[PDB]
Symmetry: none
């Protein structure tokens, strides 16, 4: 038993992390085949003031890049912007390039952060994409270019590269195709996060996890239909739920229907009344149905 | 968020994980050089009742082991006990044996779990050793033999191997010397954990993280001497603090002395009075000064 | 019943295949009117090293060309490039030139390969163009200049000519206007493919085919709106579906709405849980709605 | 009976329309919650020359915004781009904000325009998206920021905001994520539409509608195979027809197969020779088959 925010193993990703230096900036890049992807602000002379990315790119000389894996240096032969990412061609093919794909993550979807410092992987932890396109990712200075990945269906996906922290502390990155999540821009300017919508599927998953791990005080003799829940959700900042199908396994193993947990959400959203569920004092949407099933019953 | 539990990258450990089966038992082993270490209860014919490990070893048949590292099957040359672990001489040297050391973690110290499921690494997360020798993880059937490690100087230390779950849900394992943390026996018998002694160092770190995070409601300018606090701790199931020097960074930084925070601990131990600290409803001792320092600042 | 990746019949295409040799190089050409078209790398002295195609063309000697076909007598009169294709004017019109057009295939579209080995038609099989402009076929040494075609609306279209295989093993060719699909270079250099977007239309067709052939385990009667589905698709490297109109016959015949299949896709993309669908282990996008319809209902 | 181009009722949208004036520009905004969304060219010094939107936004004066609904003046507090849309944060939340989603419409699809004139909703009418991502509406100076919407599943979707007219008179707007349909840019530069490809599906429905109204002078006893037509279609800037859709509802209730109508399209494409069909003197592709079915029969 037990519920913890976990990350999938980082082994296959670690050999792809390199140190990218330009000028007085140092951050992290992703080395796959003969190219390195990194945040394009590594070439910005002053990341604390407004950045003219056109001018910065004209100013670039390839020989000013320093790219290193451990301390074997990789020479850059070509550089281009792709969206908010720099794509740098190097002569050396990463001999440990894993089989992989690029995709993005949706609100509610969980993924793994390999947080890196100046080319050195330092920690790994699970996060969850929020509706405004931000994560709570505990990034600090020196961690830009840190990589988010998912393992799903035996496929390694790269889904995130870290760029910046908003004023409210939320974290903003791009996918590996240079599109910033949330449409935020890679500028030190004031950018507002906005209305965060709770992932309903995840909250249902949380309550199932609660049931499996011993906690049951919140369930009553009431259940509400999926439609009625989706009506409620659309005006209380919760996602609609498409299908109960995702939880079948969880309903079967616990004997609790999705419709009962839906009613629980409506109630519990108004407070826990002092009590806690799995130590949390409020509903938590950071765990997907998949994460819960994995953790409770094996991959 | 603010303060989140992290793990260190698992890449160097993953190639050491093997699937070990004997009879109806399947768990994980640690493959280092030409040996595999795993919980000796893998050869227990019935893990639901008391086990005579002398007899079990006596009647072991070496060809009844199945040991596998993905692509590779290993043959067992000899079996012996080291404490509560089996040490199995195998016919093949692990080509990916990393540079490693062994140590035991002490109460209050954090480490990483590579949760493995019948030979396959599935997840990575951080835990903290409690005074009674237990951790609060998330282990299910199939995860015995899962490995705990720290990346330190800057080498790899193996510190934990998973064996069992107590009636109260706490998790129990051994060091790689075969000594069960907390002295629990590897038997399916009732075993009491005993009273948890909170790590004062970690709780001070917790409160610094809260202050760093802008939460001030619990502090006064009133302080408490290190000697005074330790007097209290001794009869309130909190560790005594040796010295204050480990917090100098956080102290100088927040402008709050350790002594002030000691005052907070004695007061907050009587209850949070319906407020929270970093979304917690009571004092948390799972984050070390190191963790808080690192997770907030320049490595 | 049954589902098989098929090829339209190759008879009309077979008389158009000729052997083109130059120096030690031997491959295939398409003979139409008074022109033979083939991959330009036939005139490269060493295809295992990078090629200067301007130098190679500058020093072509027309009498070094060898064109052969069992029922013809052909001399090269002239040569020039069109993109990556060599276009040879010959001194004889193909008497068996069929009515034909050139067109390019788009991502998701299926076509036929006539695989030829040094001028000799050897096999024929169906393929599907992926979003990165590659196909998964089966080409070896001697098969360059193998021709792709579609019979579409009573019309013969030539759509492909084979040039090379990427490091990852995907197959690359040009249209008959000499434009390489996916913009790859006809160089023995290292070139990366990137991530293929799955055709949602094809995946939907494939599930319909599965249903018709008695596969039912994956389907439930919960449906997902086109809108919801497309939001998911946009981030999961699937194409968005424009109208369900192309499925109306399949939906009528099976009694299953597209919306019910859209829900299946979101589920099944996470994995089959170890199960199969028509012997496949993951979702398949190589079958178009057209391919499925004429195969299941002959129209 | 009878066939008119219809709009869905506009009541749910009308309370969201506000007047947005900045400097010398006056257009319409969409007030949802605490945001007013409008075309970003409202803050351009000079809409008659190339515009530097980075600078215009850089130098934007939030107090020179005059936003009025009711006669209530909203105060701007924050401006940003979201693609080609300006998103303004305002000082009062729209109490009449309806429940809504955003989606994009695709070529061939029908949707609703609420034409607004410098802040006042003035008319509502149906449009259909053309192949190049344009519509033929009726927009003049003062109508920018007019809104397109669809009602589906009782759900309100915002799908269009009006930006400009092309040189040829075709109308161009964005979705509410600020992506301009047809990839046009919000510049007073020359921009070519591309050649318009009529939707064959929509023309069939139109002809079916005509038959139902008792107009049949244009239909003969002869037919055209689906493959003959599609061949004709590529040549004559018409889209290819996929299956027969369940034109079967129409086919059955009219007696005429699709194939008969395809022959009509080819004949009628030349011109109607003085006569008309439902008042038109040329083929109309603005009605979808679904649209026609509901309009005539109700579903």
């Amino acid at each position: 038993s037990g519920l913890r925010k976990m990350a999938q193993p980082s082994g296959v990703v670690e050999p792809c992390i390199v140190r990218v230096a330009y000028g007085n900036n140092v951050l992290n890049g992703l080395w796959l085949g003969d190219e390195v992807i990194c945040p394009r602000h590594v070439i910005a002379s002053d990341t604390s003031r407004v950045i003219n990315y056109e001018n910065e790119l004209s100013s670039v000389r390839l020989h000013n890049f320093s790219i290193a894996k451990n301390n074997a240096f990789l020479g850059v032969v070509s550089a281009k912007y792709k969206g908010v990412n720099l794509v740098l061609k190097v002569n050396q093919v990463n001999p440990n390039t894993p089989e992989h794909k690029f995709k993005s993550v949706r609100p509610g979807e969980s993924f793994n952060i390999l947080a890196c410092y100046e080319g050195c992987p330092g920690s790994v932890y699970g996060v969850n994409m929020r509706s405004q396109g931000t994560i709570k990712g505990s990034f600090i200075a020196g961690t830009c270019g840190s990589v988010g990945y998912v393992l799903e269906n035996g496929t390694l996906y790269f889904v995130y590269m870290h760029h910046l922290e908003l004023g409210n502390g939320s974290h903003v990155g791009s996918n590996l195709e240079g599109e910033m999540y949330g449409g935020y821009e890679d500028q030190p300017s004031m950018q507002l996060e906005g209305t965060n919508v709770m992932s309903s599927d995840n909250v249902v998953a949380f309550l199932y996890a609660a049931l499996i791990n011993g906690e049951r005080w919140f369930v009553t003799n009431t259940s509400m239909t999926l439609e009625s829940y989706n009506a409620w959700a659309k005006t209380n900042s919760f996602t609609e739920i498409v299908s109960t199908d995702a939880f079948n396994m969880l309903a079967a193993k616990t004997g609790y229907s999705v419709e009962k947990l839906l009613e629980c959400i409506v109630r519990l959203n108004k407070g826990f009344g002092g009590r806690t569920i799995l130590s949390y004092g409020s509903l938590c949407d950071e765990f997907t149905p998949t994460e819960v099933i994995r953790q409770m019953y094996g991959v």
